[PDB]
A paper describes a structure:
The catalytic serine acting as a nucleophile in the transpeptidation mechanism is also able to react with β-lactam antibiotics because of their structural similarity with the d-Ala-d-Ala motif; the resulting covalent intermediate, however, has a very long half-life (with turn-over constant k3 ~ 10−4 M−1s−1 or less), effectively leading to irreversible inactivation.
Apo-EcPBP3ΔTM was readily crystallized, but crystals yielded weak and anisotropic diffraction data extending to a maximum resolution of 4 Å, which prevented determination of its three-dimensional structure. We reasoned that the N-terminal part of the protein comprising the n-PBd may prevent formation of a highly ordered crystal lattice because of its flexibility. The EcPBP3ΔTM and EcTPd* proteins were crystallized after pre-incubation with the experimental β-lactam AIC499. To understand the effects of structural optimization leading to the final AIC499 compound, the environment of the five functional groups addressed during the process was analyzed in the crystal structures of EcTPd* and EcPBP3ΔTM complexes.
Author numbering: 62 to 203, 228 to 570
Amino acid sequence: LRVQQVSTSRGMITDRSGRPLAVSVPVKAIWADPKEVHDAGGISVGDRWKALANALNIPLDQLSARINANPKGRFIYLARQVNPDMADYIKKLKLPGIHLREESRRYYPSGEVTAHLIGFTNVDSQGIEGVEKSFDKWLTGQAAHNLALSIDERLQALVYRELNNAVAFNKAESGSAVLVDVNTGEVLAMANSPSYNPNNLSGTPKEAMRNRTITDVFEPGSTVKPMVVMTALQRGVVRENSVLNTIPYRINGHEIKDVARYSELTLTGVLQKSSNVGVSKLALAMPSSALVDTYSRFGLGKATNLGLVGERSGLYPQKQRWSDIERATFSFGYGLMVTPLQLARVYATIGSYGIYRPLSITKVDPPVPGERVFPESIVRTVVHMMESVALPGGGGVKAAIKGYRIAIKTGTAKKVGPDGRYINKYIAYTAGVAPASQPRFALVVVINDPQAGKYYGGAVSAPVFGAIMGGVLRTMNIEPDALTT
Ligand SMILES: *C(=O)[C@@H](NC(=O)/C(=N\O[C@@H](COc1ccc(C(=N)N[C@@H]2CCCNC2)cc1)C(=O)O)c1csc(N)n1)C(C)(C)NOS(=O)(=O)O
């Protein structure tokens, strides 16, 4: 006869290098056998029995009422996480029913730096959120196992240090950032702000406990424009040397206007100035299924398959009929909703020059055989085109790193509101790859609703990119690609 459901230790979570991210700490817990007292021990008062309740700081009247609450049970928790020096005194009191049992509570050395991804456990050491829940059966002993994540705590800590201070400085509602290795699909960083300290889950609002990298969905905005140009090159609408007439016009009665008045722009200049008129005239010159297909090939609308709780696949339009105004707006954001993790996998394919690799939060044994979803030559051309964004004249010139070549694309989305209409709050986007000569990392920096002054990604989310991606290349010892080194 067994009256105990779980009575064993649990595993340990580390990063890809072996640094502790989630360690079990052994703690003693006082329990009692209520059937032992009533059947043969006999419920008594006075003696040292009263001092036993006086040591637990529980009144002897109600402590005796909790054990006597059921004369048939064989287990009852008197206290939790008792220290050894005082628990050894309770065992030395020789109680005819009280026993000691070695349990374990969790400690996370990263703390709030990896909180949304690591997660936590309940008082009985059962995973609830994040990696703790997704790999509970693996970590739980009954068959104890360890686990090594794909996160690099060196890069993870520097992404949080800049993303957390960016949300605070701009007084933004939220802020997410995802870093993924280009040619392996391994998630290196995954930070959110504001966060919580999983070592103490007291008064932490559940609104700040959601993994916004996989939960929040937003219209990607201008960040999908590289795929608009990449599709326009394969469909033969234009060539790399084409010049588009970017004069504002009206599709289906609604005005299509750029950020500024540009009479004509280069194909490279469209991604530079983020011309909605340029991408709209390209989308209208193609079948509507072209952009719907290419977006899917890069992972949009598809599941990320990480196994994390609350992981959304985003809203993706499957319409069979498209209005000309809906085809044009679909080129620069309107129409679909994707998580920051899905947007990172898009640029994880852009960096791979058209290779779609699955996302994994565990250390992968190389090599990772992906699947070529787009011609390598076209992506190489557009990736070099995206470098103009981080050069004088582009939108993400504030994201430029001193001594490196990067290819990025800024964005600014209008938040759809509670009643379905667009609000005056914006989503600042900045996503790109680096090094531009040989891509190795893909980064996405998205912050929710800036209120400090500016709101577009090129002025709010872009300087976060250059500060983060700057530290990523220094830590990984990547050779500079700048003309002036
Ligand atoms: C790309 O996503 C695209 N934005 C949109 O199409 C969407 N909304 O656009 C809103 C306007 O956003 C902006 C307005 C003005 C500026 C700006 N002042 N630019 C600076 C001028 C000075 C020199 N540096 C540049 C920036 C953004 C709106 O319509 O109110 C949209 C798409 S999907 C969705 N839900 N909303 C642009 C505006 C091209 N991205 O611009 S950005 O600079 O790359 O961030």
